[PDB]
């Protein structure tokens, strides 16, 4: 139909120009996308450069400080003991007593004891009273260098053991007399050893530990001084007075009272108050039944007074460590979606090339 055929060719002269425009828009479309991606790309690069130049170095300085710190803290833990010993020698100018448990631990003390040149009876005794042994010991710094410290421990050796001791107390008697040989007495080889300074004897339970260094040796006759002062077999060490006098001496299992003159004394009890009044003379009172004794206006305590309990509570300390976790899986899913979209974008192009037809 001659005239429809011209209508066709018009559709088309006219088609080619439209498909020209079509393609111009498609190109601008592709240029827009190029730019997005150029920008996006630079923003990824800057992101990495943040991590590498800004973040990473800070995370290393911190790894280093933490290492420094830990090391220091571990210095003080792994030298806890060397460090305590130098504090001790520092405070006391190089000679301490008693021998601390930093200076000499229990398994070491026992070690040394089972090596001392003494009988098993002595070795056994010391093994039970490690406390007293430590207090009669010295610790004498001997060689000190940066990487090693050295010091002599000096423990006591007992020349005799398991002998009857006894502690003597005295009060006035009424002219007046007072025995001036108070203190500890222990039997030594056929004689009595007498220790007159309280500082030299330690006592733990029924057990006594004295230092013979400043002791006096006496004949066994001194014990007759306990019943008769003018005992003709040993002249008693006494102190006189031409005037009335009165006081109280507090012993270990009670207390002596010497009440002479116009002075008034009385033993009381924490439940019944005053339970005895002393007349002129020498009485003795047991710490079982009496709790205080009162000479004139001064008050003696025959027993330790039990007091108020104190209690300091503590709370558990807690450590809050909240870890940082990343959404790895979801992420990979989105990147897996992005590779999927590129795969099919190349499909659509391969399809298009095929109509031109480039095959690839």
């Amino acid at each position: 139909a001659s005239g429809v055929a011209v209508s066709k060719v018009l559709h088309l002269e006219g088609e080619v120009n439209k498909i020209k425009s079509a393609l111009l828009s498609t190109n601008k479309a592709v240029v827009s996308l190029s730019n997005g991606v150029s920008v996006l790309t630079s923003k990824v690069l800057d992101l990495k450069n943040y991590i590498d130049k800004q973040l990473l170095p800070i995370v290393n300085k911190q790894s280093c400080s933490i290492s420094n710190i830990e090391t220091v803290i571990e210095f003080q833990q792994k030298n806890n003991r060397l460090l305590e010993i130098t504090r001790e020698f520092s405070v006391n100018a190089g000679v301490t007593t008693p021998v601390s448990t930093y200076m000499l631990t229990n398994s070491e003390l026992l070690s040394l004891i089972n090596d001392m040149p003494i009988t098993n009876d002595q070795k056994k005794l010391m093994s039970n009273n490690v406390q007293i042994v430590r207090q009669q010991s010295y610790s004498i710094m001997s060689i000190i260098k940066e990487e090693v410290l050295a010091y002599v421990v000096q423990l006591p050796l007992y020349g005799v053991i398991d002998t009857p001791c006894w502690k003597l107390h005295t009060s006035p008697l009424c002219i007046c007399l007072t025995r001036t040989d108070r203190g500890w007495y222990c039997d030594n080889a056929g004689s009595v050893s007498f220790f007159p300074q309280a500082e030299t004897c330690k006592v733990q339970s029924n057990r006594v530990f004295c230092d013979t260094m400043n002791s006096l040796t006496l004949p066994s006759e001194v014990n007759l001084c306990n019943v008769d002062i003018f005992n003709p077999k040993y002249d008693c060490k006494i102190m006189t007075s031409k005037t009335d006098v009165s006081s109280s001496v507090i012993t270990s299992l009670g207390a002596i009272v010497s009440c002479y003159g116009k002075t008034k004394c009385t033993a009381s009890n924490k439940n019944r108050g005053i339970i005895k009044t002393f007349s002129n003379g020498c009485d003795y009172v047991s710490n079982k039944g009496v709790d205080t004794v009162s000479v004139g206006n001064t008050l003696y305590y025959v027993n330790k007074q039990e007091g108020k309990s104190l209690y300091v509570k503590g709370e558990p300390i807690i450590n809050f460590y909240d870890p940082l976790v990343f959404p790895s899986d979801e992420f990979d899913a989105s990147i897996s979606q992005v590779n999927e979209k590129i795969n099919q974008s190349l499909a659509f192009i391969r399809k298009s090339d095929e109509l031109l037809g480039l095959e690839v």
Binding site: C64, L82, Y151, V227
Partner: protein, 72 residues
């Protein structure tokens, strides 16, 4: 209870019987020695450049040891 107490009115005095002695008459001396767990300082830039903790700790220590070295 092994420990008791007799009181002698005749001589104003109390005695406490029933203890067991142990008289020191000698000294036993043993030489104890103790090594330092030293710290090898790893050198690197930390958080604060003015803070050299490892060093300041050794210095502190080397000092304590110097003061003692001078008592002899």
């Amino acid at each position: 209870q092994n420990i008791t107490e007799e009181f002698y009115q005749s001589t104003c005095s109390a005695v406490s019987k029933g203890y067991l002695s142990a008289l020191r008459t000698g000294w036993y001396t043993s030489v104890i020695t103790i090594e330092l767990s030293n710290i090898k300082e790893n050198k690197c830039n930390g958080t604060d450049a003015k803070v050299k903790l490892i060093k300041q700790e050794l210095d502190k220590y080397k000092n304590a040891v110097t003061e003692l070295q001078l008592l002899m």
